[PDB]
Amino acid sequence: MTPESVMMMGTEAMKVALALAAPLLLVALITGLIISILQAATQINEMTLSFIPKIVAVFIAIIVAGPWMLNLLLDYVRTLFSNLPYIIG
Amino acid sequence: VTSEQWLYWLHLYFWPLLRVLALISTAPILSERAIPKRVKLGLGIMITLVIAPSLPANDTPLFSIAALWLAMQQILIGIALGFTMQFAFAAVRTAGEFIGLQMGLSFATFVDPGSHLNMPVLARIMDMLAMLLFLTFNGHLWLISLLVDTFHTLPIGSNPVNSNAFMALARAGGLIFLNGLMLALPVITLLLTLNLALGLLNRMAPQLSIFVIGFPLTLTVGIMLMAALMPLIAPFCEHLFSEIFNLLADIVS
Amino acid sequence: DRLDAALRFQQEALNLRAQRQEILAANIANADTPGYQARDIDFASELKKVMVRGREETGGVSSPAVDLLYRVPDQPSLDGNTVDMDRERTQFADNSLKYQMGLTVLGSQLKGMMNVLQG
Amino acid sequence: DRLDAALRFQQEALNLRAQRQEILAANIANADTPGYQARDIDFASELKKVMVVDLLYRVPDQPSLDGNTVDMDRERTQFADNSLKYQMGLTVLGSQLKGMMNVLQG
Amino acid sequence: VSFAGQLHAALDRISDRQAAARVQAEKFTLGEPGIALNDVMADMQKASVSMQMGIQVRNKLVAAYQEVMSMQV
Amino acid sequence: GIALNDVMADMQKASVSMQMGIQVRNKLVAAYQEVMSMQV
Amino acid sequence: TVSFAGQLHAALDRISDRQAAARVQAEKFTLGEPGIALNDVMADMQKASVSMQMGIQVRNKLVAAYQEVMSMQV
Amino acid sequence: SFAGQLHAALDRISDRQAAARVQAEKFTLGEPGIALNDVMADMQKASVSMQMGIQVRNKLVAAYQEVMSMQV
Amino acid sequence: TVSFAGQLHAALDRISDRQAAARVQAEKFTLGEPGIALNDVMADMQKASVSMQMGIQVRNKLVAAYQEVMSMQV
Amino acid sequence: TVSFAGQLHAALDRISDRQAAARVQAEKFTLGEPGIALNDVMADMQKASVSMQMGIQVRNKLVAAYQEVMSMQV
Amino acid sequence: SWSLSVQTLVFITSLTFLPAILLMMTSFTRIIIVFGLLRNALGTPSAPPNQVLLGLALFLTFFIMSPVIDKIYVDAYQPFSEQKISMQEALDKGAQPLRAFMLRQTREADLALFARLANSGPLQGPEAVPMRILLPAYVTSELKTAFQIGFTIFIPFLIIDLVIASVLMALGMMMVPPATIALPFKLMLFVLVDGWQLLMGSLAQSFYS
Amino acid sequence: QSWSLSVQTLVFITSLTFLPAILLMMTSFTRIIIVFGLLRNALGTPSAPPNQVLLGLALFLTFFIMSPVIDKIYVDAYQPFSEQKISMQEALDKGAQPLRAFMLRQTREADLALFARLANSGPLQGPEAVPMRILLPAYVTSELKTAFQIGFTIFIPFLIIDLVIASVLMALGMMMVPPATIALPFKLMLFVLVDGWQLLMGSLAQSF
Amino acid sequence: QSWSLSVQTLVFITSLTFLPAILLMMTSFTRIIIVFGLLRNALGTPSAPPNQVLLGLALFLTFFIMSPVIDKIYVDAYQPFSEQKISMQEALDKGAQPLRAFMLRQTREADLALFARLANSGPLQGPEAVPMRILLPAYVTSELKTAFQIGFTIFIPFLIIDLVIASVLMALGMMMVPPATIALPFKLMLFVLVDGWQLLMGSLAQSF
Amino acid sequence: QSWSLSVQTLVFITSLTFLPAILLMMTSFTRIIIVFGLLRNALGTPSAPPNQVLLGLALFLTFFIMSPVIDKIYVDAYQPFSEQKISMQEALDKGAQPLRAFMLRQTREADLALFARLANSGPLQGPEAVPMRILLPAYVTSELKTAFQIGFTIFIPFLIIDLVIASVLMALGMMMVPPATIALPFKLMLFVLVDGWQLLMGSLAQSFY
Amino acid sequence: SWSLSVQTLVFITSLTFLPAILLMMTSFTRIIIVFGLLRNALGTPSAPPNQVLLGLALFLTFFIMSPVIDKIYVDAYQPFSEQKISMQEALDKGAQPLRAFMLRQTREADLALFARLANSGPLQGPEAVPMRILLPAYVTSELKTAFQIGFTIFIPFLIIDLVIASVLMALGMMMVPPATIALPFKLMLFVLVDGWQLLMGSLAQSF
């Protein structure tokens, strides 16, 4: 009820969002950086060949860590809906 | 006996109802479409039932241009109060949308302005957070109390009016921008530095950077930055509400 | 103000009809009382008078500010009352129909207004 | 039912008036029977008893030789009065029902 | 004192008039002396008129409430 | 005291005035919502 | 444990038994059975009519309220 | 033009109403030469004309609202 | 194999037969055919009117319900 | 080629013709014409009223259908 | 007591205000506001059709207001039906359990504000609060509670859209709308975590707590 | 014991007011209409088939699905009531049985358990002890959940097409094009080459 | 057997109530309306022709297409009824046949089989005896499928134009130039030059 | 032969409902608003002047365009109606002819031929004998085609500006600069200096002649 | 003076056209278009909500109509009570200040075009321009004025965007999008100079 509880609500929610999005974004960033440094080493420059492995890497990311995200988000939503009638004002 | 003078009761219960309902239809949270219309009408009716008997009853007939002037006055007062209150949420929405646009979340606006493709999701997040904070600080009760109080300052009866006062509400349009800049400032600046950092990377081997490495990094950095910045809005939320409230108190009179 | 002024003539005429019928009923009630002169009012003159200057009362025992005039007797009577029953019952029926006419006109005007307002 | 309690008094009065009307007409019909006693009921007491019948003999006025105590004038007046009161009870009960109806109509 | 108070007062007055007329009618039907049929019938007439007045006031009042609740906010 | 003639007439006049006020406010509110439902 | 459906069933029963009692009284009075009076027959019929008007008005109010509640938008 | 025709129609309807009201007012005072049936017929004709005006206003307002609600 | 249109057709036809029977009975009574009583003629006419009014009310309820069902935003 | 406008014009002409015939017969009866009876005048007026009411109801249904069809979002 | 005609008239007139009692004195407002907000959240403004949600809200309100209705029936309707309590006293007796139910769920701040706006004297205990103060205080408290519940409801459905947009933006697909992708995932979430049982139980507890 | 004919007429004509409510809450109309709306959202165009066509088609589908239940009601309740062999109340009680079975067969256990918890129900026992006022909201909740389960998996192929087209377009280089604009004709192609309408009706019918 | 006059007019008004449903689900209005909406979406102009204009065009096209069916109904069914030659029941039965034939001409056998198998209908010999309750949903489904086919095919030339302009812009290096702004005027020019409106209406009419 | 007063009133009020349909399918309005719907797209601001401003401006322009037709209808048909020298049927027959001529002069022959063939009409001797059922949809089709022609032609100078600005931006190596935002103010410049609105309305009015 | 019921009908009917009066007769279109163009300038099409912009334009319109409202009050509101002039002579007398304002804000070319569109040859004087010719001409003039003000607003933001892009290109960066960098600088320039208050002051001065 108190504004401290509200702002905590937003923080924990958006940290959950950060945890959900961090693996995919970080995998894409690492793949892009690796392809870019390889291009710099080989002196190859086409703006389209960096887009190819990124999709494959990010799609594999759901294969490997997808169940973890799905279990984390469901637990968050379940706990939020269960604690809903105790943060009422 | 068995009089029950109806015109007296109607004139006593009408104009306060007009002002209360005019505030209701525009005041934030009390004007959200999710509330059924009958609930809003009943709240206005009950508030008027509580308030009106204490006020001096007016005797101007409903079939006169004086009644039209009175109705216009009540509508103006109600919409002015509600809109001045709404300005703070407008400012919060502006700050959130700008943080989100510096995230690169909606890049299609820079190339196709107003092209039916825009999602200010951060703006919505902080808008609903601001609504929750406003509910917590009981701002709506204050709004109702000030709606009641503006009578003593400005009675139902037609009273003369001023000018630059309207400018003040219009000049409040500056606040939406001015306060929005500060909220952002605590994050956009660092994001700016990050973009500057990306520039240093592009000053190296040409191409092979930006649109491939900049976007995910800046998205994650914006996310964690403003996630850490979330505790900061609440003092600024109270500052915004106080600014709107004392501006209203000073200018309505 | 405007609506009050527009409906004021028929309302006042209907009130004067009611008072005239009260007077006629009083005449009918006292029809066998010895020494009772029948009373009646001039409807048109009193209606214009109430029109120009608002309704007023003698007290308020209360009674209207109307002028109670005496009816001219038809034929003499030993007891000494001038209530001739034919005249009383003709005026009663005529006042009845005119009051119903006033009700009809006022109701028609009020519907003629709800028709405009209703939407 | 509450509806019965409102209309109980008038219904009982109407029924008692009908019964006493029958008794008075029986007294009229048997006027010529030698040895017939004129019988009647006390309306108020029986109305109390039903709201909360016994026949009472009429006090003879003139002594006849055949033992008949029925008097024409007394019972004719009572018969007319009972008819009038039956009509009045019908009027009152109908007015109450009509009021209960116009309350509901709409 | 208030509008609800005035309506309650009007209802009480109408009910009291109706009960008085009914009680006088029952007293006349009882056979108690001094009660005239003229007064009974006139009082029943007045009670009926008062009931009809109350019905009309209720009808209008309900119509006005329905009109107010139909307002779009 | 006040008769049915006056009671009914003022009762009707009040009903008419209340209906007029309701209709005028509805028109004003509809115009305001049409203005605010704009697209700038 | 109150039951609105049970209360409606009880009220409908009250009306229906009142009507049936009046009808059977009229039945016996037409058949010529002694002990039945015409004024009682008419009074019971009118009581049944009043009860049915009660039921009709309550039905109208309930249906109007339900329709206005269900015509609302969330 | 069109506003002129609307103004003329409104003037005719109001003249109808005024004539009926004046005739009824004169008849209320007991003035001779005015009959009850004529008063009632004039009142009903005025009511019919006013209802026609109301209906025309409703149709015109609905048409204007439908036109102004189009998506350019 | 239950078709609602079939039941509506059956009810409509039954109303029609009742109306036609009442009309023919009145027709025959007017022509002075012995064996027809006025009271039965009026009773059957009133029964036909009751049946037609019941059909009218059922149609009104069905049409209203169809319009409320058919106007929802999908 | 059947056209709906032609059918509507024909129906309107039939309604107008029936109304005009009833009005003419009533006018002639008022003027003291011998070969016209009051019952026929009243029956013809009632039939014209019924026909015009049917026309009004058909117009209402047609207008409702048109306003429903033209309110689509295509 | 009143005449039977007056009692019937009052009963028929009071039957009119049933929607007002349902909306302004009952648990209906919070549930309907929460349902509207949730429908706004999932991105399907016409999904459970208004009638379905209205029926569910009516059944929920009937299940929630059961003890109050039971207390009214046992204390007011039963003595009134048995001719033990007059018609003008059954209303007063039955208005007390509803008043208590409205009080418990109301808030001090609203009560203080509406006690000040009426210029009434000090209210040392809750037993001095009239209905003219409790009614709008209860209404405002219910509105605020419903909006709080809906606004904490809204957060996950916007979180999903945020992460969807960020993931789409990582790969450079800047012209893909995020709402169209997020809607199936929001439906999947609301299916997985017992979308309705948890919400139903949370609302019911929110009343009984 | 039987109700009077006037009471029967009053109840019968009053019950017709709940016909839209019965059709929506108690029958299969809700699930079909929700699935159709979700499919319209998934097609890429929000109002291609007018709401009227979808509503009529959903009504026909609901009638065809519920025809066995309607036949059972007619055999059990309507026919013996119309022949004046059972009373109105007993006919309603008998006819509530097949509809209760239909509602139970598609009811989630958790929904029924929760709504029995909220209604203070204690020793329930046989599946034939659940009252109508408890069974109905549980059925509505289960129908909403099932409709959402169907919709979110109806969404899948169109998301696949959208993602494939966007990925191909951006990887090829044309990143300034709107992928949805090019994708909509392909969504229509997929829907018409699979026979999406016929298969969707088959799946909706076989869901019961 | 002939319905009395009051029953006849009750039936007539109740049937007039169902007019939009008949127009949408029995005539060619739905397919034309769907194709028009898809075409408007295809030009990149979501609100250029107002909805009322397209609705009126679809209504007139439907009237022209259904003129032979209306003529058959008039000649075979309505005309004898208006001359009191036949009753209303047999007139309606005779008028059903031409409309039924028209709807069967434009339905797909697979959808008819689906709705027959779903409704548990017994084997039906030939197209002569197929209930309207079976034919109507199948015809609606077939119309939906055909409309989607036509719209998807229509979407092709504008897709060609968009792709060619996007490629021309991209091969010039213009990386941040959106192709919609350049494509919209050329889409309008293409639709104007081929006499698009009359050609598309003629194609829709010819397909019926 | 004249219709009764009741039938005349019924027909008049019924025909009053077709006012938007008549305005769209029979007057100039369809060509105007559609062009506006495209012009706001050419300027790069979909917001543009508000929708209601454009609609009312189109309405005023339509009235000015149809002033001669309205005057001819008022003179030939409605004036005898008001002065009692004509019936309602004859007035309806006579007043449509100037509007039919106005519709025919802007009707392309190909569309008219298409709708004839589609109605299986017999040999029409001359324009004067063309049925309204054939003239209305053909006029609407030709109207749409003409509006699209005008809109595409309007789209030209703004395309010129966009191409020039994009070429200038790319020739300087400023490849990452979106040219839409830069070229929007120059489109506003072009519309201001040349007096775009007045020129466009004059061109539309002259086009109808 | 005509009937009261007809007066009520006319008044409620004229109440419907209130958005038309606000848009076509007052200046509301000018402020709303200026706000839309300014929002398009900063690069954020949803930063202030459309509701807030509409309300700000409404308040600005109310102030800038306050002199005309005062003239209406003097010429129409007051004498309608003293009954020196009423009904006809006054409604037109009260509308006269609107005519003066719209003549002031209307260009001559639009009026000339709309006159030759109505074949009104003998329109010689400038205070007897009919409403049919005055209204659309005034609307077109308002559109032109709003577009000019929008371009003037556009100039500094376009300059800032161009400067940012030029410095990015000169510094060696060829891939960094200049919009992301230039957006916060656009905002800090807009706030620091206090763009909003000067913008409203100029709009009020713009009449």
Chains in touch with E (≥3 Cβ pairs < 8 A): B, D, F, K
Give residues with Cβ within 8 angstroms of D46, minimum separation 6.
D16, D53, D54
Residue among B110, B114, B210 whose CB faces N178 most closely: B110
Give residues with Cβ within 8 angstroms of K174, minimum separation 6.
B107, B108, K168, L175
Please state, in angstroms and rounded to a whole number, the distance separating the CA atoms of residues J3 and K100.
70
- Residue carrying structure tokens 């969404």: L155
Judging contacts by C-beta atoms under 8 Å, the chain G residues touching residue B34 are 74
φ, ψ of residue M178 to 5 degrees: the values are -75, 140
Paired residues of O35 in beta bridges: none
Contact M192, N152 (CB under 8 A): yes
What is each CA distance from O150 to B72, B94, O45, in whole angstroms? 32, 21, 15
Burial status of residue N156 (CB atoms within 10 A of its CB: 0-12, 13-18, 19 or more): exposed
Pairing verdict, β D56-57 and C39-40: unpaired
> Which segments of chain I does DSSP mark as H helices, in order?
4-30, 38-70
Judging contacts by C-beta atoms under 8 Å, the chain B residues touching residue F27 are none
Q: H53 to chain O, minimum CA–CA distance in Å?
A: 9
φ, ψ of residue B248 to 5 degrees: the values are -60, -45
Q: Which helix (H) or strand (E) holds E69?
A: helix E37-69
Give residues with Cβ within 8 angstroms of N205, minimum separation 6.
N61, N64, N65, O117
D80 touches chain E (CB under 8 A): no
Neighbours of N9 (CB within 10 A): 15
Number of residues written out for chain E: 73
What is each CA distance from B247 to B169, B252, K3, K154, N176, in whole angstroms? 9, 8, 59, 32, 44
Please state, in angstroms and rounded to a whole number, the distance separating the CA atoms of residues D95 and K5.
12
User: Taken in order N188, N191, N192, N193, is the CA torsion positive or negative?
Assistant: positive
Which tokens is O142 given?
Answer: 């308002």
Paired residues of C70 in beta bridges: C39
Task: Give which of O59, O50, O48 is closest to O26, Cα–Cα.
Answer: O59
C110 touches chain O (CB under 8 A): no
Judging contacts by C-beta atoms under 8 Å, the chain K residues touching residue G70 are 51, 54-55
3-state secondary structure chain O: CCCHHHHHHHHHHHHHCHHHHHHHHCCHHHHHHHHHHHHHHHCCCCCCCHHHHHHHHHHHHHHHHHHHHHHHHHHHHCHHHHCCCCHHHHHHHHHHHHHHHHHHHCCHHHHHHHHHCCCCCCCCCCCCCCHHHHHHHHHHHHHHHHHHHHHHHHHHHHHHHHHHHHHHHHCCCCCCCHHHHHHHHHHHHHHHCCHHHHHHHHHHHHC
Q: Which helix (H) or strand (E) holds B185?
A: helix B173-202
Which tokens is C41 given?
Answer: 């009012």
Burial status of residue O151 (CB atoms within 10 A of its CB: 0-12, 13-18, 19 or more): buried
Q: How many CA atoms lie within 13 A of M63 on its CB side?
A: 17
With vertex at residue K17, the alpha carbon angle to CA K14 and CA K23, rounded to the nearest 5 degrees, is 145
φ, ψ of residue K65 to 5 degrees: the values are -80, 10
Burial status of residue K136 (CB atoms within 10 A of its CB: 0-12, 13-18, 19 or more): buried
Contact N146, N110 (CB under 8 A): no
Nearest CA in chain L to G67: L17
CA dihedral O76, O81, O87, O89 (to 10 degrees): -50
Please state, in angstroms and rounded to a whole number, the distance separating the CA atoms of residues D104 and D101.
5
φ, ψ of residue O43 to 5 degrees: the values are 85, 5
3-state class (DSSP) for residue D39: strand
Task: Give which of M193, K8, B78 is closest to E54, Cα–Cα.
Answer: K8
Task: Give which of L21, L24, L10, L96 is closest to L55, Cα–Cα.
Answer: L24
Contact N164, N186 (CB under 8 A): no
CA H11 to chain centre: 8
Contact K181, K68 (CB under 8 A): no
Task: Give which of N56, N47, N184, N64 is closest to O140, Cα–Cα.
Answer: N56
Q: Euclidean distance between the first and final Cα of chain C, in Å?
A: 23
What is each CA distance from H51 to H8, H13, H48, M124, in whole angstroms? 16, 10, 5, 59
φ, ψ of residue N162 to 5 degrees: the values are -60, -45
Secondary structure E strands in A1-89: none
Of chain M residues 146-175, which have a CB less than 8 A from chain N? 172-175
Residue among B3, B10, B18 whose CB faces F18 most closely: B10
Burial status of residue M125 (CB atoms within 10 A of its CB: 0-12, 13-18, 19 or more): exposed
Please state, in angstroms and rounded to a whole number, the distance separating the CA atoms of residues I12 and M183.
61
Please state, in angstroms and rounded to a whole number, the distance separating the CA atoms of residues E55 and D98.
13
* Cβ <8 Å between N16 and H52: no
With vertex at residue B77, the alpha carbon angle to CA B75 and CA B82, rounded to the nearest 5 degrees, is 95
Neighbours of D62 (CB within 10 A): 6
CA N170 to chain centre: 41
Please state, in angstroms and rounded to a whole number, the distance separating the CA atoms of residues O120 and G44.
84
Which tokens is M46 given?
Answer: 């979501």
- What residue type is assigned to position L187 of the chain? K
Q: Provide the residue ranges of all domains of chain B, joining segments of one domain with +.
A: 2-253
Render chain M in DSSP notation, one character per residue: -PPPHHHHHHHHHHHHHTHHHHHHHHSSHHHHHHHHHHHHHHTT-TTSS-HHHHHHHHHHHHHHHHHHHHHHHIIIIIHHHHTTSS-HHHHHHHHHHHHHHHHHHT--HHHHHHHHHHTTPPP--STTS--HHHHHHHHHHHHHHHHHHHHHHHHHHHHHHHHHHHHHHHHTT-TT--HHHHHHHHHHHHHHHTTHHHHHHHHHHHT-
Give residues with Cβ within 8 angstroms of K159, minimum separation 6.
A13, A14, A16, A17, A20
Query: K4-14 vs K87-104: helix axis angle to the nearest 10?
Result: 30
Task: Give which of K73, K74, K90 is closest to K2, Cα–Cα.
Answer: K90
Q: Which helix (H) or strand (E) holds D40?
A: strand D39-40
Task: Give which of O63, O52, O54, O60 is closest to O200, Cα–Cα.
Answer: O60
- What residue type is assigned to position L103 of the chain? M
User: Taken in order I57, I62, I64, I65, is the CA torsion positive or negative?
Assistant: positive
Q: O50 to chain B, minimum CA–CA distance in Å?
A: 10
Task: Give which of M118, K5, J73 is closest to L64, Cα–Cα.
Answer: M118
- The residue among G14, G44, G45, G50 with the most chain D CBs within 10 A of its CB, best to mutate, is G50
CA I17 to chain centre: 8
Chains in touch with A (≥3 Cβ pairs < 8 A): B, K, L
Give residues with Cβ within 8 angstroms of K107, minimum separation 6.
A89, K137, K140, K141, K144
3-state class (DSSP) for residue D57: strand
Q: Which helix (H) or strand (E) holds C70?
A: strand C69-70
CA B3 to chain centre: 46
Q: K49 to chain D, minimum CA–CA distance in Å?
A: 34
State chain F's maximal CA–CA distance in angstroms: 61
Classify each residue of A22-50 as buried b or exposed e, where b means 16 or more C-beta atoms within 10 Å of its C-beta. ebbbebbbebbbebbeebbeeeeeebeeb
Please state, in angstroms and rounded to a whole number, the distance separating the CA atoms of residues N114 and N132.
14
Contact N45, O37 (CB under 8 A): yes
Residue among F14, F24, F32 whose CB faces B6 most closely: F14
- What residue type is assigned to position C58 of the chain? T
Please state, in angstroms and rounded to a whole number, the distance separating the CA atoms of residues B204 and O172.
9
Please state, in angstroms and rounded to a whole number, the distance separating the CA atoms of residues O36 and M149.
41
Q: What is the DSSP letter of L77?
A: I
Give residues with Cβ within 8 angstroms of M89, minimum separation 6.
M1, M2, M3
Task: Give which of B2, E52, E10, B13 is closest to F10, Cα–Cα.
Answer: B2
Contact J74, M55 (CB under 8 A): yes
Burial status of residue O76 (CB atoms within 10 A of its CB: 0-12, 13-18, 19 or more): buried
Chains in touch with D (≥3 Cβ pairs < 8 A): E, G, K
* Cβ <8 Å between C112 and H50: yes
D43 touches chain E (CB under 8 A): yes
Burial status of residue O192 (CB atoms within 10 A of its CB: 0-12, 13-18, 19 or more): exposed
CA G68 to chain centre: 25
Neighbours of G1 (CB within 10 A): 7
In angstroms, what is the resolution? 3.3
Burial status of residue K124 (CB atoms within 10 A of its CB: 0-12, 13-18, 19 or more): exposed
Number of residues written out for chain H: 72
Contact N137, M53 (CB under 8 A): no
Please state, in angstroms and rounded to a whole number, the distance separating the CA atoms of residues K140 and B47.
11
C-alpha Rg value of chain L to the nearest Å: 23
Give residues with Cβ within 8 angstroms of I35, minimum separation 6.
none
Classify each residue of L37-74 as buried b or exposed e, where b means 16 or more C-beta atoms within 10 Å of its C-beta. bbbbbbbbbeebbbbbbbbbbbbbbbbbbbbebbebbb
Please state, in angstroms and rounded to a whole number, the distance separating the CA atoms of residues L147 and K50.
16
Please state, in angstroms and rounded to a whole number, the distance separating the CA atoms of residues O176 and B215.
11
Give residues with Cβ within 8 angstroms of N27, minimum separation 6.
N62, N65, N66
Contact C13, C47 (CB under 8 A): yes
L47 touches chain J (CB under 8 A): yes
L53 touches chain M (CB under 8 A): yes
* Cβ <8 Å between L51 and I57: no
Nearest CA in chain B to G73: B36
Paired residues of D56 in beta bridges: D40
3-state class (DSSP) for residue L73: helix
Q: Return the number of CB contacts < 8 Å for I and M.
A: 29
Task: Give which of N188, N184, N32 is closest to O146, Cα–Cα.
Answer: N188
Q: Which helix (H) or strand (E) holds C69?
A: strand C69-70
- What residue type is assigned to position D25 of the chain? A
